[PDB]
Design an enzyme around this catalytic site. Structure first.
Site, PDB file in Angstrom:
ATOM      1  N   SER A   1      -4.822   8.909   2.084  1.00 48.55           N
ATOM      2  CA  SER A   1      -4.602   9.395   0.749  1.00 48.55           C
ATOM      3  C   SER A   1      -5.699  10.260   0.122  1.00 48.55           C
ATOM      4  CB  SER A   1      -4.274   8.260  -0.206  1.00 48.55           C
ATOM      5  OG  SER A   1      -2.937   7.840  -0.027  1.00 48.55           O
TER       6      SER A   1
ATOM      7  N   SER B   1      -2.468   6.415  -5.810  1.00 50.56           N
ATOM      8  CA  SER B   1      -2.229   6.832  -4.446  1.00 50.56           C
ATOM      9  C   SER B   1      -0.714   7.019  -4.135  1.00 50.56           C
ATOM     10  CB  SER B   1      -2.883   5.827  -3.505  1.00 50.56           C
ATOM     11  OG  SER B   1      -3.506   6.499  -2.431  1.00 50.56           O
TER      12      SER B   1
ATOM     13  N   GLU C   1       3.802  12.042   3.755  1.00 50.81           N
ATOM     14  CA  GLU C   1       3.797  10.602   3.624  1.00 50.81           C
ATOM     15  C   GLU C   1       5.156  10.043   4.046  1.00 50.81           C
ATOM     16  OE1 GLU C   1       0.300   9.209   1.247  1.00 50.81           O
ATOM     17  OE2 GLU C   1       1.422   8.670   3.048  1.00 50.81           O
TER      18      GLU C   1
ATOM     19  N   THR D   1      -9.266   7.150  -3.003  1.00 49.50           N
ATOM     20  CA  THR D   1      -9.254   6.296  -1.810  1.00 49.50           C
ATOM     21  C   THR D   1      -8.234   6.752  -0.777  1.00 49.50           C
ATOM     22  OG1 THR D   1      -7.606   4.752  -2.752  1.00 49.50           O
ATOM     23  CG2 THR D   1      -9.896   4.304  -3.160  1.00 49.50           C
ATOM     24  N   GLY D   2      -8.319   6.118   0.387  1.00 49.70           N
ATOM     25  CA  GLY D   2      -7.328   6.224   1.392  1.00 49.70           C
ATOM     26  C   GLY D   2      -7.345   5.050   2.301  1.00 49.70           C
ATOM     27  N   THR D   3      -6.158   4.690   2.735  1.00 48.29           N
ATOM     28  CA  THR D   3      -5.939   3.567   3.634  1.00 48.29           C
ATOM     29  C   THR D   3      -4.816   3.952   4.582  1.00 48.29           C
ATOM     30  OG1 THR D   3      -6.495   2.195   1.740  1.00 48.29           O
ATOM     31  CG2 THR D   3      -5.638   1.072   3.737  1.00 48.29           C
TER      32      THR D   3
END
EC number: 3.5.2.6
Length: 269
Positions: A42, A100, A140, A209-211
């Site tokens: 993200s 996100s 996504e 953030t990103g995951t």
């Protein structure tokens, strides 16, 4: 030294860690696997928003985008809420950054590049910023799911930090557009346990953030000292030894951010 601290973080978490902090007048560059590739996850949504802001008058933020439940195939806490009524481009930028929101990001991608051109257009905005290394290939949720080593959908700590630098601390955006980006990142809800957790409370932090799969955990941030001195912090990680479903470790990023804050805050350094 710092490379050893980072190395021990990798052993203890069974993780690969990437860190970049650009040099300033006062401080040297902090670099650990800074030119190795990591999945955006993200983190792409920050420059995605900059791109839609950059390419449009501010009145474009009030354009209503309508979409269906068929469009929701990724984690979309805000888009799901507004599926029946639609969301404005501004609302989508808000959601992409602060929650996100995956569907919000996909819609912003289509807004920028058209139905099949979005990822090429986003990648192109980054090329317009002098980043020749990063690439977005899928939307996504697939962008989170490439195997380790696949160059698709990757950036490096180095490249995304410098991109963020231009967006927040440089002139990539005019001041009114730059404020919007900065406001959204400042009001992010997903980052409290990452870069934020490694900086003292009188330091200001904005982040994205990103995951993702294979235990991917990322955070990109602009930080400000209590006197207003700015730094850019990119931390990236994965844990591909556990496979596709490996636990991402937010505390790996808080610790890397603590090591960084230790260098930037303590005036013996």
């Amino acid at each position: 030294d710092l490379a050893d601290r980072f190395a021990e973080l990798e052993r203890r978490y069974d993780a690969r860690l990437g860190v970049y902090v650009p040099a300033t007048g006062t401080t040297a560059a902090i670099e650990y696997r800074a030119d190795e590739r990591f999945a955006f996850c993200s983190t792409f949504k920050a420059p995605l928003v900059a791109a839609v802001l950059h390419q449009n008058p501010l009145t474009h933020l009030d354009k209503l985008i309508t979409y269906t439940s068929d469009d929701i195939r990724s984690i979309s806490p805000v888009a799901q809420q507004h599926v029946q009524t639609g969301m404005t481009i501004g609302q989508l930028c808000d959601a992409a950054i602060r929650y996100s929101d995956g569907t919000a990001a996909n819609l912003l991608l289509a807004d920028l590049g058209g139905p099949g051109g979005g990822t090429a257009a986003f990648t192109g905005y980054l090329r317009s910023l002098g980043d020749t290394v990063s690439r977005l290939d899928a939307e996504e949720p697939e962008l989170n799911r490439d195997p380790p080593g696949d160059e698709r959908d990757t950036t490096t700590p180095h490249a995304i930090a410098l991109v963020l630098q231009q967006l927040v601390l440089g002139n990539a955006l005019p001041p009114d557009k730059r404020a919007l980006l900065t406001d959204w990142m400042a009001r992010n809800t997903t980052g409290a346990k990452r870069i934020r957790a490694g900086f003292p409370a009188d330091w200001k932090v904005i982040d994205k953030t990103g995951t993702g799969d294979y235990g991917r955990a990322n955070d990109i941030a602009v930080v400000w000292s209590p006197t207003g001195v700015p730094y850019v912090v990119a931390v990236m990680s994965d844990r591909a030894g556990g496979g596709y479903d490996a636990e991402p470790r937010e505390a790996l990023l808080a610790e890397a951010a603590t090591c960084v804050a230790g260098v930037l805050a303590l005036e013996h350094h």
